[PDB]
């Protein structure tokens, strides 16, 4: 399911996955918000509540920042159109976050792990990341 939150300024915000094993193996210790170009057919299934980022990973590639292996299901009705369900997903970070990451994910113990899926107050998809450290 979704789970829904307004803050203290009204904007509502749609958590619609959590990698709980994220948070209970690894030490947090920095996040970020990135944004994250989806299909459509990707958008309806996310909105089912039904993905988790079990063996996801991200990982960066000539300079840019990906969301690999995240399983999002097929769309019940997109037919030819349903995406590839574990496509590479661009993350779309400012150029000062993603040097300070291409640095922090070089250090031993150090990864960066993605923590939650939401659509914020305008509607647009999220991937809320980390720096992490195994505990």
Known sequence: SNAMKVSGWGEMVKVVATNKKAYTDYEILE??????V???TEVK?????????????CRFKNGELYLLNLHIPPYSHGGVYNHDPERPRKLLLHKRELKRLMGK?????????PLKIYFNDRGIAKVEIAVARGK
Not at 31 to 36: F, H, Q, S
């Open 31 to 36: 996040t970020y918000e990135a944004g994250i």
């Open 38 to 40: 989806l299909t459509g």
């Open 45 to 57: 299934s996310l909105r089912n509540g039904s993905v988790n980022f079990k063996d996801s990973f």
């Open 105 to 113: 994910v070089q250090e031993e113990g150090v990864t960066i792990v």
